[model samples]
Target: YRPCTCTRCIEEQRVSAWFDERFNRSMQPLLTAKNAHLEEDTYKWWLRLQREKKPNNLNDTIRELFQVVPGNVDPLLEKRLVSCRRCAVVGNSGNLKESYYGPQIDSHDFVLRMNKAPTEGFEADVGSKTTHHFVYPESFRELAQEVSMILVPFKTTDLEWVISATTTGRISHTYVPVPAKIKVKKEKILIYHPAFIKYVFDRWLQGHGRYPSTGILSVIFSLHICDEVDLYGFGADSKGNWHHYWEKTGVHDGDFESNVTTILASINKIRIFKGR
Candidate 1:
C-alpha cells in the first residue's frame, strides 16, 4: 500500500520489471562467463540486504539509485584528465593507525568520511583532513549539529536531510545522479546502489558467486566522486571485528568480516583512487 504519486515507488516497480528483464535475461549469461557463479558461498546475502541493498524502504532504495538533484554538477568534470588528481576515502576503521597509513591518506586533496562519529584524538586513525564528507541522510541529521562542514551526500534523502539541517550555511552542491533538475541543494543525490553493481556483475559481467560488498561499493563510490581515490578501513577480517581499531566498541563480530567477498574484490579493482 505505498503511495502511488511517489515517483520512487513507481521507479521501484519499474526496476522490478527492469530486473526481471535484464537481470535474468541480458546479464545472467555474462555472469556465467565471468564465473561469478562459483563464488556463491563466497558472497554474503544477508549483509547485501541489510547493508548493501536494504529493500525495507524501497522508496529510499529508488531514491538512492535514481534521484536527480535540482542543480547539474559534472561528475565527469575531470574525465578529460588521464589520471584522477586526488581523493581520499576514509572509513571508520582503526586499522589505518596500525598500518601507519594516516599521512598517506591525509595527503589527498579530498577526504570522504562516513557515519556521524567524532574524530577528536583519533584524527590520525580517522584521518584529520576532510575536503568533502559523504554520509547518509539519517546519519547526517543525527550527527551534524553545529559543525560547519561541507557535505557530499549520496541520496536525495541525504540532500533533503542535510539541507533541512543546515539551511543557513553557504551550501553548495553537485547532483550527478540525474540528467535534469540540476539547480542547487535540491539537485539529484550522487549515491549509487550496490544492487546496481550486483545486478550488473551477476548479469552483464557474468559473475555468479558472492564477494565482499565494501570493495565493490567503495570502488563505485570512488568512480562516482573522484578520479583518483584511496580507500581505507574496509573489510572486517577473520576476527569479525567491526569496531574501529581506535575505538573499543563492545559490538564485535562485524557482519562484513564474514561476508561480501565478491563485493570487496570489486572495490579492490578501483586502482585509480589509490594514487596508483
Candidate 2:
C-alpha cells in the first residue's frame, strides 16, 4: 500500500490520481456563461438547450439549478458535522418490489428519494425516512401531495405551486446560489454543475465503469447535500413489465440512460453506502 503519515494527504493523493486519469480522456470542460470562443449562434443554442432541458418556471421548478445552496460550498459543514456518517439514495422502481432492503435502508442517517414513488405501504422498499426530495418542474403536479421537494435548476417553477396546491405553506426553498460564499434570500435552488459528475466516475470509480444519466444526476443531487448515499428504484424495464414503483416513473418519453450518459459517467465517480 502507498502509505503516508497523513491520511488526509493520502486521500487527497488518491483523488488527485483519480482526476489525473479522468482528464487524460477526452474531457469536456465546463462551459462558461460568457465566452468569446463560442459564437453568438452557438451561445444562443446553449441557452435554448438550458431552457429546454431544465424547468425554468418559478412555479414548477427552482427556475435554475444554480438557484439552490450548493453542497460543495458550505462554510460551516466541517465544523457543523461532528458525527456525520452514512446516507442512502433510494430510487423509485418496480424492481425493488421484492427486495427486502427496507429495515436496512431505513437505518441510514440520510435518505434521498427520486421522483414520486409511494412510500405509504412499501416501507421495506421505499423506506420510511426521507431527508430530501428532488423533483423536476415536469413532475410537480403529481409531487405536491406526499413530500416537499428540494429545487434543482433547469426546472421551470418554484415552491409557489406547492403553496397553492396544499393550501398550507408546507413547501420551502433554499437560498444558496452557485458554489460561492455569497448568501441570498429564499435559498436558491441547487445547481447541477457538469464537472461534479465527471469527478465522480473519473476519480472515485477509477474509470472502471459507467452509469445512466438519471443515475448520475441522482447522485449529483445527493452530492450537493448528503455525506453518504444509497440508490434505489432506478432503471425499470422499459416495456412496462413492472407496476411502476413510483407514480411518476415514465412521464418523459425517453430512457434515462440515453439522455444522461455523461452525467452517469460522473456519478460513477462517487462512493455508494451499502447497508451495515
Candidate 3:
C-alpha cells in the first residue's frame, strides 16, 4: 500500500497522473451556451451512437434537451486554470455515513452530488454546499437556483420531462412519475451529453453490468471539468453491502464500479476518499 499523505497532496498527485495518462483536451467539453447548438450532422452522429445503449425514439428528444441545456456550460472549464481545479464527486454509499468528511468535501472548488442525498441533517458528514446536483427525471428534486442542475437522460421521456418541468409545468406520464415543475434557472440547467454517457459505457465500463452507474458518470464528468478529482462515499463497507448513506436498499453495481474506480485510483487517475 502506498504511504498515507495529506488529502491535498494526494489530490495533487492524482491530478498529475491523470493528466499524464489519457490526455484529452476536449474530453466531453462541458456544454456551454456558446457550444450548445449541435451541428445537424454532429447531432445525428451523437444520436446514432447513443442509441446503441437502449435504442429509442430520439426524434425530437435531443432537440428539446439541447434547447434547455445551459449555454453557460464552459464557465467552470473556461478559466485560465491558474491552479488545480479541485472537485469532489460525492456518492451516496453508506461508507460515508459517519466519515465526517463534510469539511474536506466542501473544500473543493466544485462539489458534485447526485439524487436526493440530503445535507442539512447530515451536514457534518456530507457538507452543506452543492455546486452541481446530478439527477434524472425520476430522481428530480428542487434545488437552489445557484446550484447547477445536471440532468442525465436515459431515455427520450427523460429529456421531455426536463423541458416540461421547466416550461409547461407538466409531469411525465411515464412508468415513474417525476416532478412536473422544478424551480431552476433555464441557464443553470445542464444536460449530460448522451455521447458522454455512451463514451463511459463503451470506453470505460466496456459494456459492464447493466450500464455505467450515475456515480461513475459524475466522476467521469468531473475529470473533464476539474483539474483534481476526489471521490467520497464510493464502494461498500466490510460486508460488501451496496446501499446509500441514508437508506438500506441495495442500489448500483458497487462491486464492479468500485473495481473500475480502484483501478483509476491505483493508477493515480483520481483519489478516492475512504473514511475510516
Candidate 4:
C-alpha cells in the first residue's frame, strides 16, 4: 500500500493532519443545554435548509428538551484522558453482509449505528454492540437499556416530539406517525445539535442533501469525540448495488455526499473498512 504519498501528508508526515482542527472546533456532536440555542443568523441559516417550521419559543423548547435528558456536558468525553478513543461507525450498507466484522466492531470504545439498523440476528456480520444509535422518530426503535440514543431531528417539532416521547406523551405525528411514548431511558438520550448539522451541511457537504443522512452524521460525529474512527457498510456493496447492510437508502444528496466520503477516506479523516 502506497501510503503518505499525498500532497500535504507527505510534507507534514502526519496522516492525521488531514483532519482540520479548526473545522472540528467549529462543529460539535451533541446539543447540550450549554450550546442548545442558536443566534438569529445561525438559526435562520439552519431553518432555510428544510421545510421545518421555526419554533415559536426555541429557548423554552430547548429547556424542556434538555430537562428530559438533563445533560449540559460531554460526560463521556470528560472521562477520557489523552486517549485512544477508537470508534467503529457501522453503516447499514449491504457490504457488511459477509464481512464478518462484528468482533472487530465490538472491540472499539464506541460503535455508532444509524436509522433502524438491527443487531439481534446479524451479530457476526454487523456486530451486536452499539454505543450510540442515531434515529428520527419515524425510524425510531426501542434501544437497549444501555445504549445512548441520538435523535437526528430535521424539524423544530422533533424537539417537542423527543420531549413528549420521553415524558408526557402529548405530541405525536409530525406529518407521519411517531410513538407518543417510547421506552428510551431519558438520561441516555441527546439531540444531534442543529447547529452542528448546519455546519456539516455548509462545510462538508456544501448544502447538497435536503438534510444530512443519519449515516454520514454519525461518521462526522465520531470525528469530534473519538481519537480515531473506522467506518464500515457505507456506499455500494461488492456487486456495486447502492444499498445498506441490513436491507438497504434516503431522499437526500446523491453524488455530492458520496464524493465527500471518498475524499475523507483519501485524506485519512476516516478509515474505511473494506468488505470482502
Cα error, residue 107 of model 3, in Å, equals 1.0
TM-score of each: 0.46, 0.50, 0.79, 0.87
**What's the true lDDT of residue 86 in model 3?**
75
Quick one: ranking by TM-score, best first? 4, 3, 2, 1
Best by TM-score: 4
**Per-model C-alpha RMSD:** 14.6, 10.2, 5.6, 4.8
Give lDDT: candidate 1, residue 36.
25
With candidate 2 superimposed using the best TM-score fit, by how many Å does residue 219's alpha carbon deviate from the native?
Answer: 0.7
Residues 1-276 of candidate 4 have per-residue lDDT tens digits of 112322222112345554453254545567887777687887887666556754647788887777678668673444245335678998878888889999999998889988888998899999999988998888888899999898887777878898888878987788788899999888888788888887777777777766777776776677666666789888877788877666614457757777777777787766798785
Error of 4 at 51 (Å): 2.3
Q: Distance (Å) between predicted and true CA of 130, model 4?
A: 0.7
Which of the two candidates, 1 or 3, achieves a greater TM-score against the reference? 3
Clashes of each: 40, 39, 4, 7
Error of 4 at 56 (Å): 3.2
CA displacement after TM-score superposition, residue 18 of candidate 4 (Å): 6.5
Q: lDDT scores for all predictions?
A: 0.40, 0.42, 0.70, 0.75
Could you tell me the lDDT of residue 117 within candidate 4? 85
lDDT of 3 at 195: 60
lDDT of 3 by residue, 46-115 (tens): 5553354554456555556667765445544553433556788998888888899999999987899999
For candidate 2, write residues 1-276 as lDDT tens digits: 122232121112245443344333222222122211334553343344234344333322322222332323332123135334355677656767767678877887666676556677888666887655665433432332333344332322233332222333333432321211212222322333334344444453433333223345555445434444456555554445545665524323234342333343354433332221
